[PDB]
Enzyme design. Structure first.
Site, PDB file in Angstrom:
ATOM      1  N   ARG A  60       6.152  -3.805 -67.000  1.00 53.76           N
ATOM      2  CA  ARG A  60       7.038  -2.731 -66.363  1.00 53.76           C
ATOM      3  C   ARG A  60       7.929  -1.858 -67.232  1.00 53.76           C
ATOM      4  O   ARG A  60       8.186  -0.776 -67.041  1.00 53.76           O
ATOM      5  CB  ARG A  60       8.123  -3.574 -65.391  1.00 53.76           C
ATOM      6  CG  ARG A  60       8.004  -3.603 -64.209  1.00 53.76           C
ATOM      7  CD  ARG A  60       9.083  -4.688 -63.599  1.00 53.76           C
ATOM      8  NE  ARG A  60      10.425  -3.928 -63.804  1.00 53.76           N
ATOM      9  CZ  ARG A  60      11.286  -4.286 -64.417  1.00 53.76           C
ATOM     10  NH1 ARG A  60      11.249  -5.533 -65.203  1.00 53.76           N
ATOM     11  NH2 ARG A  60      12.449  -3.638 -64.477  1.00 53.76           N
ATOM     12  N   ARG A  79      -0.819 -26.026 -44.561  1.00 52.92           N
ATOM     13  CA  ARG A  79      -0.009 -25.203 -44.280  1.00 52.92           C
ATOM     14  C   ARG A  79       1.419 -25.276 -45.129  1.00 52.92           C
ATOM     15  O   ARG A  79       2.459 -24.559 -44.612  1.00 52.92           O
ATOM     16  CB  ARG A  79       0.304 -24.553 -43.052  1.00 52.92           C
ATOM     17  CG  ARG A  79      -1.116 -23.930 -42.213  1.00 52.92           C
ATOM     18  CD  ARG A  79      -0.883 -23.788 -40.715  1.00 52.92           C
ATOM     19  NE  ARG A  79      -0.278 -25.000 -40.263  1.00 52.92           N
ATOM     20  CZ  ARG A  79      -0.327 -25.243 -38.857  1.00 52.92           C
ATOM     21  NH1 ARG A  79      -0.850 -24.435 -37.956  1.00 52.92           N
ATOM     22  NH2 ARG A  79       0.459 -26.295 -38.436  1.00 52.92           N
ATOM     23  N   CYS A 128       5.580 -11.677 -52.521  1.00 55.51           N
ATOM     24  CA  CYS A 128       6.361 -13.013 -53.287  1.00 55.51           C
ATOM     25  C   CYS A 128       5.659 -13.106 -54.650  1.00 55.51           C
ATOM     26  O   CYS A 128       4.940 -12.255 -55.214  1.00 55.51           O
ATOM     27  CB  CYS A 128       6.023 -14.112 -52.223  1.00 55.51           C
ATOM     28  SG  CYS A 128       4.290 -14.809 -52.811  1.00 55.51           S
ATOM     29  N   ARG A 165       2.251 -14.879 -59.698  1.00 57.75           N
ATOM     30  CA  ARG A 165       1.291 -13.641 -59.894  1.00 57.75           C
ATOM     31  C   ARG A 165       1.324 -13.221 -61.347  1.00 57.75           C
ATOM     32  O   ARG A 165       0.225 -12.332 -61.688  1.00 57.75           O
ATOM     33  CB  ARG A 165       1.844 -12.633 -58.916  1.00 57.75           C
ATOM     34  CG  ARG A 165       3.439 -11.810 -59.345  1.00 57.75           C
ATOM     35  CD  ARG A 165       4.097 -10.765 -58.219  1.00 57.75           C
ATOM     36  NE  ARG A 165       4.900 -10.169 -58.889  1.00 57.75           N
ATOM     37  CZ  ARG A 165       5.995 -10.022 -58.032  1.00 57.75           C
ATOM     38  NH1 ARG A 165       5.955 -10.099 -56.817  1.00 57.75           N
ATOM     39  NH2 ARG A 165       7.162  -9.566 -58.697  1.00 57.75           N
ATOM     40  N   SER A 166       2.504 -13.532 -62.271  1.00 56.22           N
ATOM     41  CA  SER A 166       2.648 -13.472 -63.532  1.00 56.22           C
ATOM     42  C   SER A 166       3.122 -14.559 -64.235  1.00 56.22           C
ATOM     43  O   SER A 166       3.891 -15.144 -63.547  1.00 56.22           O
ATOM     44  CB  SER A 166       3.322 -12.003 -63.902  1.00 56.22           C
ATOM     45  OG  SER A 166       4.529 -12.121 -63.637  1.00 56.22           O
ATOM     46  N   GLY A 167       2.692 -14.720 -65.407  1.00 57.73           N
ATOM     47  CA  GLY A 167       3.483 -16.039 -65.978  1.00 57.73           C
ATOM     48  C   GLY A 167       3.615 -15.654 -67.600  1.00 57.73           C
ATOM     49  O   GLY A 167       2.646 -15.132 -68.160  1.00 57.73           O
ATOM     50  N   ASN A 187       9.411 -23.222 -65.798  1.00 63.94           N
ATOM     51  CA  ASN A 187       8.794 -23.419 -64.311  1.00 63.94           C
ATOM     52  C   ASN A 187       7.990 -24.545 -63.919  1.00 63.94           C
ATOM     53  O   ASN A 187       8.075 -25.528 -63.054  1.00 63.94           O
ATOM     54  CB  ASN A 187       7.774 -22.123 -64.202  1.00 63.94           C
ATOM     55  CG  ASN A 187       8.685 -20.903 -63.513  1.00 63.94           C
ATOM     56  OD1 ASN A 187       8.454 -19.987 -64.062  1.00 63.94           O
ATOM     57  ND2 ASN A 187       9.157 -21.432 -62.432  1.00 63.94           N
ATOM     58  N   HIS A 190       0.372 -14.186 -69.683  1.00 59.92           N
ATOM     59  CA  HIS A 190       0.772 -13.212 -70.872  1.00 59.92           C
ATOM     60  C   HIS A 190       1.663 -13.812 -71.774  1.00 59.92           C
ATOM     61  O   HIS A 190       2.540 -14.805 -71.409  1.00 59.92           O
ATOM     62  CB  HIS A 190       1.105 -11.889 -70.214  1.00 59.92           C
ATOM     63  CG  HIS A 190       2.309 -12.114 -69.575  1.00 59.92           C
ATOM     64  ND1 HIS A 190       2.222 -12.081 -68.132  1.00 59.92           N
ATOM     65  CD2 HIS A 190       3.799 -12.005 -70.126  1.00 59.92           C
ATOM     66  CE1 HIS A 190       3.621 -12.225 -67.761  1.00 59.92           C
ATOM     67  NE2 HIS A 190       4.215 -12.186 -68.839  1.00 59.92           N
ATOM     68  N   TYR A 212       4.043 -12.350 -74.676  1.00 54.59           N
ATOM     69  CA  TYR A 212       4.988 -11.255 -75.293  1.00 54.59           C
ATOM     70  C   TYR A 212       4.673 -11.117 -76.792  1.00 54.59           C
ATOM     71  O   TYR A 212       4.526 -11.972 -77.570  1.00 54.59           O
ATOM     72  CB  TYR A 212       6.285 -11.092 -74.919  1.00 54.59           C
ATOM     73  CG  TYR A 212       6.716 -10.530 -73.831  1.00 54.59           C
ATOM     74  CD1 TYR A 212       6.986 -11.429 -72.649  1.00 54.59           C
ATOM     75  CD2 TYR A 212       6.645  -9.192 -73.522  1.00 54.59           C
ATOM     76  CE1 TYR A 212       6.925 -10.836 -71.317  1.00 54.59           C
ATOM     77  CE2 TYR A 212       6.904  -8.676 -72.056  1.00 54.59           C
ATOM     78  CZ  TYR A 212       6.971  -9.479 -71.207  1.00 54.59           C
ATOM     79  OH  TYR A 212       7.175  -9.018 -69.888  1.00 54.59           O
TER      80      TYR A 212
END
EC number: 2.1.1.45
Lengths: 276, 276
Positions: free
Chosen positions: B29, B142, B161, B181-183, B192, B222, B224
């Site tokens: 981002r 569910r 989410c 969605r991203s880690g 986590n 990903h 860094y």
């Protein structure tokens, strides 16, 4: 079921085999028995091939026609089963399904009226939003569209989705991860693999990217007791090379794709298997 | 980052190694560089052990205290960064975060007033709903709770989410799959893993089940650029046996867990690594 180097198909066969040896007995909604494993993933390349499974003939023309109906946002069944219980008499005659299926892809949250009503600009268009973000910010980690089982919508507030699809862009390749909360391995999974791979090619085509990978994750991955014997037979078949999918015209917008824009080539599957 | 036989830790190290050799450069981002792979999964058993990673000392007391704050549904930062831009002057003084974090776990969709307001019975309590369904229908497919990045809530309608957590019950064992969605592999993922494994034990305890497996799926997994050198060093360390987590009292309801109800035992990690 889209809302409601070693060959990649080896993943699928290995997953079947794992559920057979290691799955545990677990009942579905209707009290029908399954063998179940929690948590599974497979990756299928889309680069220069298309993952239409070859160990049984997959109903490709049906995959294509159902996806095009979802894309159009239709609630008219004629244009193409406990939730039917919540429909009025008059309306389920004429094929009106209510605010269900592609209605959520194209008009999420719009006040429903009838299946011939005009919903332009009403609700969130998840599909166009995915495509617009691919174009405005390809690095975005939020390129997500969900689908619901129609049965769940009036069942509770904030009902959990059935499937979530996340797109990912890098080096001008489009990839897609489909997480399904439950996956019927015998019948639904092959059809879904082809369906989300086809969607991936359609949107790569319109955004001028190249298809990359398709990743399938599943929650409760299960085999119906009835499907065990045919699946044992399918396991002893050897995968043939995946076919190619060819888009036969330059198409500008998602709503403009027609069933005869697609051609599958070099598909040589083993014979059809009927799963109950 | 919870809203915003071979040792199981080998999965994690193998995933690090894969991103290092095979990841592609992709910006986040802020335009900061990462190495990225799309689509990954790992399974960690919770049976008689607790997956607190051992190749570096994980901040366990911080995992515990942040989860208990989420569970309480707090929006008071004092009880414990682009979205801060949408807060008024007076309110972000006093530590009021707005309708963000555990507010979505416990009061999804409730009209926000202030961080000391009384939200009983307002909005969907995802957390209690998960627990009630475990008790009323354990076969349910569910059993799903989502978390949002606070930055996304006012950004659009139907914002995707950040994480979805699905629970699964069989033979009186509770298992959990977390799809993010991203880690951030260096910093967020270990924290986590411990966090959702801890939640899994808490709810197994209150529903009288046994912890089973924890499955982590990630979209954009990903590393860094800055974290590459310390991670290379962490890879050459050998995992020690996972510790145990012991709950020290019989606890009846989710909101009744206190930080000193938990004890970690036989944790012998390698030294801390500071990741930028």
């Amino acid at each position: 079921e889209l809302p409601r180097p070693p060959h990649g198909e080896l993943q699928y066969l290995g997953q079947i085999q794992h559920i057979l040896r290691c799955g545990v007995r677990k009942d579905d909604r209707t009290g029908t028995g399954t063998l179940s494993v929690f948590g599974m993933q497979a990756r299928y390349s889309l680069r220069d091939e298309f993952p239409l499974l070859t160990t049984k003939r997959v109903f490709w023309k049906g995959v294509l026609e159902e996806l095009l109906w979802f894309i159009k946002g239709s609630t008219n069944a004629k244009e193409l089963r406990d939730f039917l219980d919540s429909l009025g008499f008059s309306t389920r005659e004429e094929g009106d399904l209510g605010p269900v299926y592609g209605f959520q892809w194209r008009h999420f949250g719009a006040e429903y009226r009838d299946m011939e009503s005009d919903y332009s600009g009403q609700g969130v268009d998840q599909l166009q939003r995915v495509i617009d973000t691919i174009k405005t910010n390809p690095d975005d980690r939020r390129i997500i569209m969900c689908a619901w089982n129609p049965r769940d919508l009036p069942l509770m507030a904030l009902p959990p989705c059935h499937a979530l699809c996340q797109f990912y862009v890098v080096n001008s390749e489009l990839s897609c991860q489909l997480y399904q909360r439950s996956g019927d391995m015998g019948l639904g999974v092959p059809f879904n693999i082809a369906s989300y791979a086809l969607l991936t090619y359609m949107i790569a085509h319109i955004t001028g990217l190249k298809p990359g990978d398709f990743i399938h994750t599943l929650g409760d991955a299960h085999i119906y007791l009835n499907h065990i014997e045919p699946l044992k037979i399918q396991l002893q078949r050897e995968p043939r090379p995946f076919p190619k999918l060819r888009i036969l015209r330059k198409v500008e917008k998602i709503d403009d794709f027609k069933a005869e824009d697609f051609q599958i080539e070099g598909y040589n599957p083993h014979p059809t298997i009927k799963m109950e």
